[PDB]
């Protein structure tokens, strides 16, 4: 299962009662875990810090994460670039840009397991298609990824898929193995 993408569909909860929030909840403080929430946040400071804070700096990893998360064009436009200060005292970002800063912060952290709880929810069909493909598919291709989704296109591209029911019931397999089940 190491280095694979598990797409979780079905009854996976919503908001602060999502299945992943619970789990991460029950785990509240044995390998490293990087969690990406459904709702994006920033803390006052630079764009760079909002992505790399707390993790050791790698020039190659930082720049690749920005490229894959579609932040290269956004950042370039700002006069200060990635040294642009965020918040009430600085620049105010759009939901889409902040969603991308949130994903980059999770993707940049070196961890043994990545738990992405619907991080494309507030992104457009075009932005999501590109980020899913260049970030979770290509960039994170050698990482153990657990992506909560609800998009049939994300189940088609995952190594293994998991469909949850409200009850104890569930399907664990591939998208093709699911298609052959009661076609």
């Amino acid at each position, epitope marked *: 299962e190491r280095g694979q993408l598990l797409a979780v569909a079905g009854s996976t909860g919503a908001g602060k009662t999502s299945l992943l*929030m619970m789990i*991460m909840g029950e785990l509240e403080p044995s390998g490293r875990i990087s969690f*990406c929430p459904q709702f994006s*946040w*920033i*803390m*006052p400071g630079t764009i760079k*810090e909002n992505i790399i804070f*707390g993790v050791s700096y790698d020039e190659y990893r930082y720049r690749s994460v920005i490229k894959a998360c579609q932040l290269e064009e956004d950042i370039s436009k700002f006069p200060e670039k990635d040294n642009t200060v965020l918040g*009430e005292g600085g620049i105010t970002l759009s939901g889409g840009q902040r969603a991308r800063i949130s994903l980059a912060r999770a993707v940049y952290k070196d961890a043994d397991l990545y738990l992405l709880d619907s991080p494309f929810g507030y992104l457009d069909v075009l932005t999501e298609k590109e980020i899913f493909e260049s970030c979770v598919c290509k960039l994170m291709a050698n990482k153990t990824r657990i992506l909560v989704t609800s998009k049939m296109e994300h189940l088609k591209k995952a190594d293994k898929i998991l469909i949850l029911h409200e009850g104890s019931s569930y399907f664990y397999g591939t998208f093709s193995e699911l298609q052959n089940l009661q076609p």
Partner: nanobody, 117 residues
Framework: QVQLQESGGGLVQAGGSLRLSCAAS????????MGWYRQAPGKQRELVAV??????RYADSVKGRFTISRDNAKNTVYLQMDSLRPEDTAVYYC????????????WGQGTQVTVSS
């Protein structure tokens, strides 16, 4: 809206400890992250630690000494400050990231932490 009041500041000797509290009021259910900052005189507010469901992060200068924790029942975010050095002398602030249909951040009032030799 969200109101943040910091408590727990004080005068300590080097090697000592302090447990800082950041008490949230108002729409505390909409807070999705909490940062801890420090400001020295005539200098900017530097992020020290940040907490949210799934992660805790620390500045390279505080790692292995400071612990960011939380109590959801009390709506308080703590900063355990161990093996304190004079350079930790600052005014510590908490910033909360809030999403309630629209997004913004909120600052606290500050708590003076003084560390002597």
């Amino acid at each position: 809206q969200v109101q943040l009041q910091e408590s727990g500041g004080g005068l300590v000797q080097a090697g000592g400890s302090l447990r800082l509290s950041c008490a949230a009021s108002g729409s505390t259910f909409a807070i999705i992250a909490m940062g801890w900052y420090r400001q020295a005189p005539g200098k900017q507010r530097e992020l020290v630690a940040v907490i949210s469901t799934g992660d805790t992060r620390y500045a390279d200068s505080v790692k292995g000494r400071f612990t960011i924790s939380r109590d959801n029942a009390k709506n308080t975010v703590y900063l355990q400050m161990d093996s304190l050095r004079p350079e930790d002398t600052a005014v510590y602030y908490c910033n909360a990231a809030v999403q309630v249909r629209d997004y913004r951040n909120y600052w606290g009032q500050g708590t003076q932490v003084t560390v002597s030799s």
